[PDB]
Symmetry: C5
């Protein structure tokens, strides 16, 4: 097998429509936000404009191939793959994906998709111009798949943060939750990412 | 049947262009707005910028399958399904869908589609900064299907999912069903009017 | 025939690229604007931002079917049928269609397409804050089909106009024109819609 | 042949990806801008927002048909034919096409494509509020085809210019150029359109 | 072979999803930015709005053809070719491509793709209104292909800068880097382009 064969096979058979659950166990999705920039904060309206890399990993065995004498990994357009239907609950704009929409697939079926996203959120901006800073909580989970189909888990904080931002990051913490909504009888998991940041002073 | 079979079958046969009327009876569509945020309000121009989950349900029997030893539900891209052609009569921007465009289909043919939408409306903003608050009325119905093809009906805490970080707060949400004949066409068109009573904190 | 058959047949045969002229006579298109809102006006720049329902009707016999024991009408995505290439000559933004892009087809081939459109125009805004108001003229016609292929004709004023607009409509009148442009030897028809409005 | 046959044949065979050079001679493209509006001017940033009809003509013999007992012309979506890859060198926004994207094809293979375009440009705005006015130069040519593959030539100046603009046109002149860039060994032709205008 | 054959063959066989690595050696991509305009420099937020031609070259042997008695080059839509997945790490808007999305392919498989791009960046704007000027660093590299699959190298770049900009370019320098990120075990190459500019 070479890359052309692998990509041909994936394109013919991946079934992007089909969640790759194994034996009625949920697909375990890991999500981790690497913050790159904070662009346009408004303490009056409690809105924030943020740029982050959304590191997203999961397993899809239907993509796997025998890597004997073959490439161990390929880059695949996400339109040819099943991707988790993650949404940020407190987003107030649709995600603007700034990078090529390619995922990386390993021969055992492990997938990494890590777009750079600019998005606007509704969150607590109070204290942004103080030494304690503001804490903006971003909540991300599957929109349509309950906890028996998709589970979501969290995997330096300023590591890739732009030095040219007007803001600086004090801390980033994660928390996993499982919530039942009035609409539906089942539980839906999310990861809440708390971004503690402040204006440079 | 597993998920792959069900989704394959739906993709091959659903007919997204065909309204699934049963025996010349209208498709009964239920619509309910769960308000999440009020983002911009302008009392001079009478305009409002709102985020809401549009809970939309209907039945399409052509999607049904025998759920014996099979999954009870699948998530399906709306491009593979018939969806009611709902529109907001007083919208002044196109709906910005913030979430993955997937519907949930139950084995008996019941569909739920519940996108998070940000949209701007023309409505009565007067009184927003008073105790009584403003009442903004949002009118939603089928754009091209009359009352014998689509009926629309309203389906909890109004502020249930409303953001605590909004500058506004919700006092009350009420619904009302209407049937209207327009000058353009001889038939009647149903709508739901959702009255959002809100004020500045 | 049921709806599924009719829509299948339309999808397989409608020919959206082909103007449905009958016997070398023009396709008669009717256009009528129902103003819903006036959102922003600028008297210095002579620009206006308007929302309207563009009621558009024409006949396409290639869509017709025998309605005996069959539905009399279906809703069809406009991508599956021929639609007149109307443009507003004084638009300064592309039309933002706010509604599902569906037309309604009757079994005899009559088509109605009626999108809600938000669009910006260059027009006379002077007098908007006076009793007489401003008169903004919007000119609409086929971009590429001359008068022997497409004719355009006009069919309450503030019937659907929003009560919450800062503006109010005093009068709406229409006028049909036929114009020859320097670029091309033939005549092109348009409808000019005159919107007389003022600040409340 | 009727319109349906002609359009069917064009759709099946036109090859929109293939430049219709004849016998290793360049495709002769004519370009002419008819200015409709000037919407915003900035003398500090030297930027202008303009609306114009871009009259573009060329010949593509692969489109030709025998017009004996047949329509002489059809309107065709530009996605179904080859179109020159023209770009404005000093544009600072992408062209916003305001009109239906249809070209008109004559039976001998002559094509006219004439979209209404709104676009922003970087150019010399100095003098706009004086009697002499400003002269904004717009440079248009093929982006990827050199002079042996595409040649570009120019074909009342205020003829279609909006009376409601804050600006007025004093003169429009054209000039053809042929330029070698550092990137590539070959020459690339352009037309430079000089728009002399001023605030009323 | 004529142009129609070559383009037909490319469309049928190019495999736009497949990186054209040769013998487990990386595809060598060359990138060079030719700055055309600087449109907004926000001294509050450290954000710049820039227009540049992104000259991008690489080799794809699967595109090659025997050029004996045949055209030496064709223009090809990028949707029909593999293109490197380059991204600007400090971009804060998606790239707005202002030009026709065509690449030029030589019979030996050499590809040139050179779009005009408008994009907004986060970078050091301090000193823009001083004699030394500001230095804005733009970092560009493959998003998903590591150093054994794609290498990136720089090929002045201010020759095409608009004379009507409020800004002027003092110097442009490039630097190649190779970086390992926390997410992934391999190294990813980038080119960092330093744009030294100031207000006139
Ligand atoms: C590929 O074939 C080898 C040799 O028999 C086998 O042991 C291995 O399990 C196969 N690889 C994968 C990934 O299954
Ligand atoms: C709160 C949201 C609302 C949307 O949910 C759904 N849409 C289709 C099926 N379901 C369940 N999720 C996370 C339940
Ligand atoms: C007011 C709107 C106008 C649009 O109507 C329609 N467009 C195509 C068919 N129909 C009927 N509806 C609800 C009648
Ligand atoms: C004013 C417009 C200009 C555009 O005309 C055309 N574009 C293609 C063919 N034609 C004729 N029409 C109505 C002549
Ligand atoms: C200056 C512009 C830059 C784009 O050029 C090209 N892109 C692909 C091939 N070529 C040649 N042209 C006109 C040379
Ligand atoms: C910083 C970026 C992040 C995205 O990387 C990737 N996305 C999918 C595979 N890979 C590797 N690269 C260059 C590592």
């Amino acid at each position: 097998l070479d890359r052309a064969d692998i990509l041909y096979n994936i394109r013919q058979t991946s079934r992007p429509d089909v969640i790759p659950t194994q034996r009625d166990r949920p697909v375990a999705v890991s999500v981790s936000l690497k913050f790159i920039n904070i662009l346009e904060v408004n303490e009056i309206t409690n809105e924030v404009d943020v740029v982050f890399w959304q590191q997203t990993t999961w397993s899809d065995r239907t993509l796997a191939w025998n890597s004997s004498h073959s490439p161990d990994q390929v880059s695949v357009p996400i339109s040819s793959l099943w991707v988790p239907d993650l949404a940020a609950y407190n987003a107030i704009s649709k995600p603007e994906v700034l990078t090529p929409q390619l995922a990386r697939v390993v021969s055992d079926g492990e997938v990494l998709y890590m777009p750079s996203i600019r998005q606007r959120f509704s969150c607590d901006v109070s204290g942004v111009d103080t030494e304690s800073g503001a804490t903006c909580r971003i909540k991300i989970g599957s929109w349509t798949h309950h906890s028996r189909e998709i589970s979501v888990d969290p995997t330096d904080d300023s590591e890739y943060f732009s030095q040219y931002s007007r803001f600086e990051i004090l801390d980033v913490t994660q928390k996993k939750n499982s919530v039942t909504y009035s609409c539906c009888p089942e539980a839906y998991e999310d990861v809440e990412v708390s971004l503690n940041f402040r204006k440079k002073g």
